[PDB]
Amino acid sequence: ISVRGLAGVENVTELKKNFNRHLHFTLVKDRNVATPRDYYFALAHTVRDHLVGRWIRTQQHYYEKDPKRIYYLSLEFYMGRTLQNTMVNLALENACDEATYQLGLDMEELEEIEEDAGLGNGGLGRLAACFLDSMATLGLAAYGYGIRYEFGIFNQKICGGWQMEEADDWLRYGNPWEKARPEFTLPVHFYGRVEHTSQGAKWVDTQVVLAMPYDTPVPGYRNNVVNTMRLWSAKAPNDFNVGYIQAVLDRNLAENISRVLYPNDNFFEGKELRLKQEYFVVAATLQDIIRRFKSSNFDAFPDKVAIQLNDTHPSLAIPELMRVLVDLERLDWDKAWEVTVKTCAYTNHTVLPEALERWPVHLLETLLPRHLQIIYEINQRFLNRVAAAFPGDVDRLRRMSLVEEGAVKRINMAHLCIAGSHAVNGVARIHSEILKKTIFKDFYELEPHKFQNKTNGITPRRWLVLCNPGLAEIIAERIGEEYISDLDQLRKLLSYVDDEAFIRDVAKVKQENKLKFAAYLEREYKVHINPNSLFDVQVKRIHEYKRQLLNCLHVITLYNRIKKEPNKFVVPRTVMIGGKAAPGYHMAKMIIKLITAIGDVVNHDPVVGDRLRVIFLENYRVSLAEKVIPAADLSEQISTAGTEASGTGNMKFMLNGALTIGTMDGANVEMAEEAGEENFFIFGMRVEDVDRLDQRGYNAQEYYDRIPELRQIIEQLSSGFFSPKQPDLFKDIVNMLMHHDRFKVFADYEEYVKCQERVSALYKNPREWTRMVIRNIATSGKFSSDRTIAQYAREIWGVEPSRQRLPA
Amino acid sequence: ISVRGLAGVENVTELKKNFNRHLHFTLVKDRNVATPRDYYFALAHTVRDHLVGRWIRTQQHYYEKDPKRIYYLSLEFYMGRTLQNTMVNLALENACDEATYQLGLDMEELEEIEEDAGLGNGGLGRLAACFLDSMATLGLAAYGYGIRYEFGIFNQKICGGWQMEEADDWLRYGNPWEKARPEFTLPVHFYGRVEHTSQGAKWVDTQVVLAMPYDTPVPGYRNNVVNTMRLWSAKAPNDFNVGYIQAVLDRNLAENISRVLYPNDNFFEGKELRLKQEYFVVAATLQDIIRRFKSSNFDAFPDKVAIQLNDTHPSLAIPELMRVLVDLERLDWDKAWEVTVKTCAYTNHTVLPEALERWPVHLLETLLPRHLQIIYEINQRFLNRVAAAFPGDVDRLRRMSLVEEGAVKRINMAHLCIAGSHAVNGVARIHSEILKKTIFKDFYELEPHKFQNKTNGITPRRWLVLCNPGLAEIIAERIGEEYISDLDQLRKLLSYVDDEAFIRDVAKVKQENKLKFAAYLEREYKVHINPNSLFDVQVKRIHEYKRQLLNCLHVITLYNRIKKEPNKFVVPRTVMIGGKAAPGYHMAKMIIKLITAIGDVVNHDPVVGDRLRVIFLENYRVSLAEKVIPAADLSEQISTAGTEASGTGNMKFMLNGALTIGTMDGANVEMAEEAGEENFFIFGMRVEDVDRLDQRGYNAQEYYDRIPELRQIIEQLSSGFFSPKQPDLFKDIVNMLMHHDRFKVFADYEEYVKCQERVSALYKNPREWTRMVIRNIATSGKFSSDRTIAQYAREIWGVEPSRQRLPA
Numbered sequence A, B: 001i002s003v004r005g006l007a008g009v010e011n012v013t014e015l016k017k018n019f020n021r022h023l024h025f026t027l028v029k030d031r032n033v034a035t036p037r038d039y040y041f042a043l044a045h046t047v048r049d050h051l052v053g054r055w056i057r058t059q060q061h062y063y064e065k066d067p068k069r070i071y072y073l074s075l076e077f078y079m080g081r082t083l084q085n086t087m088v089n090l091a092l093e094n095a096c097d098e099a100t101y102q103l104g105l106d107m108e109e110l111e112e113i114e115e116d117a118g119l120g121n122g123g124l125g126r127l128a129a130c131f132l133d134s135m136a137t138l139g140l141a142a143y144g145y146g147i148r149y150e151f152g153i154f155n156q157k158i159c160g161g162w163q164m165e166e167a168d169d170w171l172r173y174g175n176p177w178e179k180a181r182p183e184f185t186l187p188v189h190f191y192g193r194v195e196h197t198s199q200g201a202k203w204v205d206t207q208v209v210l211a212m213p214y215d216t217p218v219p220g221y222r223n224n225v226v227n228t229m230r231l232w233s234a235k236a237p238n239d240f241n242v243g244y245i246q247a248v249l250d251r252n253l254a255e256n257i258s259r260v261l262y263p264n265d266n267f268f269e270g271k272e273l274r275l276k277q278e279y280f281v282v283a284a285t286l287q288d289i290i291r292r293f294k295s296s297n298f299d300a301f302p303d304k305v306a307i308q309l310n311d312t313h314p315s316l317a318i319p320e321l322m323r324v325l326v327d328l329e330r331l332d333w334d335k336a337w338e339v340t341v342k343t344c345a346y347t348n349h350t351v352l353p354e355a356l357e358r359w360p361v362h363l364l365e366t367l368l369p370r371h372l373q374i375i376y377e378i379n380q381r382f383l384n385r386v387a388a389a390f391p392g393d394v395d396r397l398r399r400m401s402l403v404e405e406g407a408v409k410r411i412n413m414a415h416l417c418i419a420g421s422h423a424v425n426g427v428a429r430i431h432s433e434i435l436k437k438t439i440f441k442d443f444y445e446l447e448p449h450k451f452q453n454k455t456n457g458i459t460p461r462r463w464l465v466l467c468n469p470g471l472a473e474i475i476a477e478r479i480g481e482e483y484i485s486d487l488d489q490l491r492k493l494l495s496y497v498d499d500e501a502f503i504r505d506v507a508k509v510k511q512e513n514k515l516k517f518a519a520y521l522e523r524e525y526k527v528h529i530n531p532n533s534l535f536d537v538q539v540k541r542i543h544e545y546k547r548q549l550l551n552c553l554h555v556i557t558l559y560n561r562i563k564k565e566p567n568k569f570v571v572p573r574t575v576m577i578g579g580k581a582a583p584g585y586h587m588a589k590m591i592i593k594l595i596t597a598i599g600d601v602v603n604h605d606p607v608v609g610d611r612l613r614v615i616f617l618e619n620y621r622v623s624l625a626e627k628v629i630p631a632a633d634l635s636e637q638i639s640t641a642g643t644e645a646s647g648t649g650n651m652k653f654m655l656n657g658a659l660t661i662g663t664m665d666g667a668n669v670e671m672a673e674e675a676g677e678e679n680f681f682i683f684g685m686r687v688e689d690v691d692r693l694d695q696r697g698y699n700a701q702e703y704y705d706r707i708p709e710l711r712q713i714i715e716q717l718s719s720g721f722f723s724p725k726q727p728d729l730f731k732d733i734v735n736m737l738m739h740h741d742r743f744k745v746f747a748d749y750e751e752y753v754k755c756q757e758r759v760s761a762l763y764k765n766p767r768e769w770t771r772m773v774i775r776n777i778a779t780s781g782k783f784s785s786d787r788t789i790a791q792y793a794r795e796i797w798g799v800e801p802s803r804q805r806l807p808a
């Protein structure tokens, strides 16, 4: 495979030498005692050595040229594995493959030993990871700042069809990629009280937690640029017998701040420990930013600094920057505010109101008393501007306030972000339009210039070259390698839609990926599947808005049709659903149980045979995405219109040769626009249709009464067909669908089933299926995160990207 | 300095190269950003690389030859710093000095950056460390097993003359010497219950904590032997929203087992967490031992395994070995017991009854229910043997029982150790004799063959070559280098007691050490001392039995004599006292405050001038011992006769050219025997005198009434002379001395003061002082830990030591 790079004689020799050096001196093993894990670590240390010179030279280069620096603040970085990604971006993959082969080792076996860095929940966390790759590839002086969670997203086990959570102890064996920087440790303050002096406000009597940074290299694609991801770890300050012992053990309370990722991406809870995490990353990060700024007045700060807020989770950056500039640097309020607004920009990732951060005032008053005072002052000055622009509009003042009245007074962190940012963006054209028309309509009317769109993207390094080398190679054969850092070049593939050789090659790559994935399932999970079946895949977090339940209704429809006419031909399918449920989300846990319960019936019915299989993919995570997405024929993107801000899984499937069945939601709209609606399986209500249904009121009973196939399914669920031992098991699911369904599952059922029949019809014609796939891959170029980051750079940050290489 | 080794052209070149390699690839720094700490780490990694080949080859050698293995079980390993010790034992010191000098670095400055590994309290912990060095130097297949405490002995700060404790965060910057072995992790069981089956007892429903080993290399002196110290770290097993988050945070409870060293070396407390630490090290260690034994029936176990118990702290080894052999390996009781007794040996380190471990039965019943059943069965069978040997002696049965009756039933762990061991030793001849005559008299009468002496020793690598290279060199000039691994060769120095050159050289080395230490005091602590004064040093943990208070009475006597006759000549003295008090020990904390309070008066009295200085040495630890002991003229070893089991500080001072003022206690007896009583300042009651005084009753008032100089001091203390602001501050000290003094401070006062006058008289004659010093250094050979370990090897473990080198 040419895209995997050169295996030079001298290169392979030096890699074998450095591998043996690390096995002996670093791991303190010989080849007699060494396990596969030791071999993985020797390889990881060998590859890491190639980053170091480029890492030092890149940071030296930024010190000398002093470019504007981009600070990407996120509570989540969903990085996955690093070894293969590093080899790809340094052009070392073939050399390491050869070197390990010559030492009697299978490199693909060693790659499987690495733990995922699971420091995120899903889309928001994975976007941050794709963005770091694109910022390095585009030569931006960019730093990712976050928390080094000791425990990432939980490992999912399925026991009796139920999700169980296990701690993700990802640092158990060590992390060869990070470098502890205990020398750059910074203090973070909590609690205390404000006293007003002659000189101004002073925040006193605080408790201190130390923020210790760990730096991870972020290599650009073959440009010798290595940027930094700096993650903060919480450390206690060093300040009778049981009393002395207990004081040492109580250090754990401070260190708990960085212990564990909150897994509730569905529902904001308002936990004190989460607020501590948010302030911890903000306070440590801003001291680091200001230190770097002063090391080569504050008028130039926005010319040298951009802070990008990944949702409201780091929104305390706005009042913390005001606190430092006013209280410590003694800038006047108006000058500090000008600097803050020009520095900060905010990205929104959902319109669902239960996910929005609204912190109780009493929590902020106790933990961050000076921040609450600054937020009140921001609010008063903001509402003074609203009053002057819309005189007499007293309801607008209530609606736009950063302070929400009620039983419990709360701060709306989204309102704070809009007030304190020069740019607010959604993550797909339809989402950005919904922000301006609905939830932020009042803010758009006051400051229309702030509101932007930045359609999401995915890195084609991880999401094509790394996970699908077969497809990357047959593309490179025709159009060369330049497309890997310029994905718009895939448009050249439209010239090959009638090329019999290319059609055969695209279909062969998919067949190989499906055999490989079918094998993985048998080996690791003792599961057998028909690799000639259509691979129908829905992988994403379990949320009612994502409508895994609509997919379930289709699966039961196909099962019932087969039982009714057993001797009729149907296109064989393997229906695969995977994703984690948030631990407290009862309905999400019941939906996983329904999927496994359907599998229990369908997969053991002798009349069905190998015509229908339903598999729940356990422990969906970045490493499993890299295996299943290249194997997929059909991508399920079936959110209720107006609920999925963008989606990024959708883009991964498009790039890897799956066709999409989807609603006109999030980026699906732009994907259909790029490929042509004739090359997408689009069904269901548009946003306008959902609004009209809400106006007259959604009555699920009407659909149950009018669609006999739907009635039969509800009767089967209610009566215990899928839970014979426990017949009322799914009553909560039935009750939600019939009486309390916010996401209108029944309203899209008929169009979905009809559209799935059209998928089955096209799959019976392999040549026409593959030609439609080529039209999708060829038009996936817009969905490169390189395009997304170039737009952030030019339209928000005010910096020019570069594909110019640094010297090696 | 020849003893520091060769600086070969090729060696210096390769060290400079590997230093620069580690600075770049390991630390990810260049010489522009590097701090002294980075340079320390580059040097440590460079030196560690030289250990690795020898470490792998040593363990391979033990696998091939399959010698009997020695397992030294200790809750404490007081290791201090590793860098200089490693360079000394590999003969790299001059090469590294040259290499660092050529790179523009001062190696002595880099050595000062290393944290002490403070994993012990004092004598018992430091003995374990000296023993590991001697076992490696004598080519024994020896393993030290302990706990990797996250926090060692607290850092001592003195604030307003009071001890404050700070957490010893010794792993803050990382530990380059250890290698995590997460692959050899073992389970340890707690709580649960015993059920009796047809097959026998089963310990079920337990909570599991994981024991993760970290291995540290232990290099022998220039023999290419590198042994292992394996320390266990506690890890939690991987088994709504607040509930999930709280379950992850509760992992801290399991991990608290290895968090912190108990600092109470004075008084046994009976804390559950301490019992968990003791079982944790025993259970993990014994599984490791049995695994290694089975990897090349149990009849051969005592031929292949020796377990040495460092006091009773790992005594649960006895019932744990019985539990594994009976419950898991299904050996009959009598065979298991035979194997256990032949495997285990016990070392006692004190006769003070408050330090003896007596665990409440209710704690053992809850935590270790199967161990309690095995202890009851051991007790019944042991008391059956006592009854058959001494028929009708019902009081002997009560006295010898492992079970102590009372309000709270307790297990006497010393009784368990004697019953379950083939050898019991004290740590100095007088101590071993006291064990047989008093506290273990009944056990000696039943099994006299078990009772041995092993007089303690110190390693001459750390305690001469490393800390006093000047003295090591002038010795090597005369008698060569062989004495460093054969300390009896120092006897050859008796030939030089009348050699004017050697007298001048010994006196010059002491003067240089005193100037160096006087400089350290000014630099680090802004303290000025007269370097021509007699350096009068008492450094050791603060305990009433050690009688720092008797030293205080002498200091006040000298001060009062000077105030009475200001214009009379007295030999100038710097009186230095240092050591940590256990956090709950109120009297020990008051004694530190008295020493600083005396300093406050004496050091600011213009009439005294530079004739008397009283300094409290803050944060006494192994690194400070290495600085102050070479600087000392007079070693204070003034414990009440019968209380100090051995002492080892005494031996360090003797080897480094200080004269000793001491009681006939512990090893002081053997030191005076070796050197001649005419070359020791021996004073005070012998053990026989203490016994006679106890028989008629100690009345402190009698001494107060008869000694006017003593009355004056007590009046000064009581009246507030040393605490003008708070005149009753020392009332508790006065009340203890007058009414409740277990250690008879007043009874030795007159003889102590008279003996101190004889010290002052000899110090006025430099030539005769130095000749007496030469007679001490020349006869210090017996106090090498190489001699001690050779005796353990031949008389307890049944293995022959070897000075034979392994190939490099």
Ligand SMILES: CN(C)c1ccc(/C=C(\C#N)C(=O)N[C@@H]2O[C@H](CO)[C@@H](O)[C@H](O)[C@H]2O)cc1
Pocket: A121, A122, A123, A124, A125, A127, A262, A263, A264, A265, A266, A267, A268, A269, A349, A350, A355, A427, A456, A644, A645, A646, A647, A648, A666
């Ligand atoms: C702990 N807490 C209260 C949390 C709240 C929210 C979240 C995460 C999301 C939200 N909202 C998220 O991942 N949104 C997705 O962002 C993708 C990238 O822009 C879109 O492609 C996708 O459409 C969004 O759903 C995580 C934690």
Ligand SMILES: CN(C)c1ccc(/C=C(\C#N)C(=O)N[C@@H]2O[C@H](CO)[C@@H](O)[C@H](O)[C@H]2O)cc1
Pocket: B121, B122, B123, B124, B125, B127, B262, B263, B264, B265, B266, B267, B268, B269, B349, B350, B355, B427, B456, B644, B645, B646, B647, B648, B666
């Ligand atoms: C937590 N706990 C209850 C503890 C109890 C005791 C100890 C330590 C000692 C005792 N006993 C000790 O260090 N004893 C010394 O052993 C030296 C070497 O043999 C002798 O030279 C010296 O004379 C002993 O005092 C530590 C912890």
